[PDB]
Amino acid sequence: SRYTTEFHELEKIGSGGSVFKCVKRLDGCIYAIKRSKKPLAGSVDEQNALREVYAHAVLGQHSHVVRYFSAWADHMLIQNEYCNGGSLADAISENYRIMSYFKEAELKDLLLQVGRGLRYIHSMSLVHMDIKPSNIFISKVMFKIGDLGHVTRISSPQVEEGDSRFLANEVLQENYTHLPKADIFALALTVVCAAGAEPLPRNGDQWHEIRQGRLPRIPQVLSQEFTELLKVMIHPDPERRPSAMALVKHSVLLSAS
Ligand SMILES: Cn1cc(CCO)c2c3c(c(-c4ccccc4Cl)cc21)C(=O)NC3=O
Ligand SMILES: [Cl-]
Missing domain, CATH: 1.10.510.10 (Transferase(Phosphotransferase) domain 1)
Known part of the structure; x- marks a missing residue:
């Protein structure tokens, strides 16, 4: 998985699925990364799940x-700025x-x-x-x-x-x-x-x-x-x-x- 190979998990900071504090191995930097169960394709829950990503991506200035860096996909992940x-x-x-x-x-x-x-x-x-x-x-x-x-x-x-x-x-x-x-x-x-x-x-x-x-x-x-x-x-x-x-x-x- 891209999550595993791209990032080193440091610590769990949120449960619900989970948000981890991770260091991206290539850029040396710490990010907050949220992992959720990937909803069924074309469901109302998927539409709600995708608005968060669409919102993040016009709301990055x-x-x-x-700040948002990336999102990708039986899990969805979003990689945001670590506060x-x-x-x-x-x-x-x-x-x-x-x-x-x-x-x-x-x-x-x-x-x-x-x-x-x-x-x-x-x-x-x-x-x-x-x-x-x-x-x-x-x-x-x-x-x-x-x-x-x-x-x-x-x-x-x-x-x-x-x-x-x-x-x-x-x-x-x-x-x-x-x-x-x-x-x-x-x-x-x-x-x-x-x-x-x-x-x-x-x-x-x-x-x-x-x-x-x-x-x-x-x-x-x-x-x-x-x-x-x-x-x-x-x-x-x-x-x-x-x-x-x-x-x-x-x-x-x-x-x-
Ligand atoms: C539980 N929790 C704790 C933190 C860090 C506070 O030091 C946290 C963060 C985020 C998020 C977050 C919320 C919603 C969606 C995606 C993320 Cl990564 C959740 C967070 C986030 O986007 N950036 C955070 O620091
Ligand atoms: Cl509150």
Whole structure:
């Protein structure tokens, strides 16, 4: 196999199939390589599997999207940029336990970086559809969007919904008029997680209350300007939320730019 002869496996970094940290023998370099069961040819699962690859391959010029090098094929493999700093989810678990979270200046920088990623994705007429901390990777720290498995075209009539902790009500209601603002809503909840919040609910009354536009408790004092920008980003009306372009140019974020 090309995987075996081309790469030396260093360590398993993800299970689900598996992602390994590998050194390509020819270029000396470390890559994250994801191995999955190859779906039946011409199936709906294969189409979903191939969109991730097509997405990766138009989304390779961006500072805040994980770079793609190659993909090939009873397994499919994708070889991406290895991010040395881990996921934002793991940074956020380490913080949780030590009672020291991202401070406001770092929450702004996270928000702005990912927001530039989404601006790039959105201007490609694409949407990500699973923005959450386990799909933001760290490598000045850099934040990069990864895991392009739910990526779709912006006017798509059918959608695979992302994680329910981070899901906009209108997407759940099957309303895809404003898909870009689903990414916006998930970015805000991602930032709240990073600020120190309790694990987000997956359903039930607390789930609904957030979808009414109310921020979860944040165990630290943020400026009103900043808090207000997070709240508008979870507004029940997707049209009231900022576009990624509006986000990155927002005055609240100027001091991060
Ligand atoms: C579980 N896991 C951990 C990591 C490294 C964090 O230090 C990781 C990465 C990726 C991916 C990934 C996600 C989705 C599709 C393909 C890949 Cl290679 C998954 C990763 C990826 O594309 N780049 C990564 O670093
Ligand atoms: Cl997560």
